Amino acid sequence: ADWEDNMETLNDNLKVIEKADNAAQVKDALTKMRAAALDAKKATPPKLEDKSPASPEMIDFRVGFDILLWQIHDALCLANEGKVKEAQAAAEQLKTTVNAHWQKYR
Amino acid sequence: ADWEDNMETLNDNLKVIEKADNAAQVKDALTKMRAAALDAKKATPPKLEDKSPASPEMIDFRVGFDILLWQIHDALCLANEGKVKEAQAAAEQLKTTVNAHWQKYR
Amino acid sequence: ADWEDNMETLNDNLKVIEKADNAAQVKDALTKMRAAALDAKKATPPKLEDKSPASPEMIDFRVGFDILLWQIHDALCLANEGKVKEAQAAAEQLKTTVNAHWQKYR
Ligand SMILES: [Cu+2]
């Protein structure tokens, strides 16, 4: 999918995590977020459509999605241990990263 | 080593997993698979040897290895919780991803 | 930060881990190491300043940080389970990888 639709997916699943009731729901949401972030890593965001795929700006963009992938992993590790509240709290900081990426690259 | 050699190492450790009985064996084989996949991630596969290093095709190649690494991680997580049967089933799916990448870029 | 500064952060936190008392300190140092490795993926070593950002040499450089990141992940997973001694042993092997990367690219 294109970058904007991947970003929609990330936001939708953040809402899911915020309102989630059990560890299975959080883990499902976070797995969908990981897939969307990995797919967005192959995309070009609107702000960088005037940059080449191997420009420093596009390399920095892809590293930004690596960073997000590791933050998703932290929440997912919490959810695998049954720590639903701690995973939701970790997802609070995912929202910060996602919002900043939206503002930076749209 | 060679990209082709790394694909071979992935398959040898996949068989090792499928014939395993305890979680430590599966973890060992998955760790070797992770190392092979990271070593292959920096390669130029045969199909892409005529393309610029800056080509989008090479970026998609490397992000495909990131997808494989996260699948390896999920199998490793299952093994590190002693769920050796679930880990073996996840590694049967890894056979698909690994050999699909092999066949895509050879 | 530039590349040498990130590598300094990695080494300072390896020392913190080597001397650490409890899991909280180990985990904090390991999360700083992860952030430094990811940030270093956006840097360029001086001797590679004349190469394409997607050149095989620069790919090798960034993937070397991916190798470090997955080793950091293993140590951080151990630390999150209270396995302080195992995390410190894994950090001792992190030092070898860090120093090899340093020697290769400085
Ligand atoms: Cu993990």
CA distance A30 to A75: 8
How buried is A11 (Cβ within 10 angstroms: 0-12 exposed, 13-18 middle, 19+ buried)? middle
Q: Fill in the amino acid letter for C3.
A: W
| A53:B59 CB<8 A | yes
The beta-carbon neighbor of C52 closest among B44, B54, B62 is B54
Any A CB within 8 A of C43 CB: no
The beta-carbon neighbor of A34 closest among B54, B55, B70 is B70
Closest CA to C10 of C81, C84, C67: C67
Task: Choose from A42, A77, A81 for mutation: most chain B CBs within 10 A.
Answer: A42
CA distance B77 to B75: 5
CA distance A30 to B97: 21
Angle (CA) B8-B14-B20 rounded to 5° is 140
B79-91: b (≥16 Cβ within 10 Å) or e: bbeeebeebbebb
What is the resolution in angstroms?
1.9
CA distance A68 to A63: 9
The answer for B82, left when phi > 0, alpha when psi is -120 to 50, beta otherwise, is left
Chain C CB contacts of B34 under 8 Å are 70
Please name the residue that has the structure tokens 């700083």. C32
| Fold topology of B3-105 | Four Helix Bundle (Hemerythrin (Met), subunit A) (1.20.120)
- Six-digit token string for A14: 């953040």
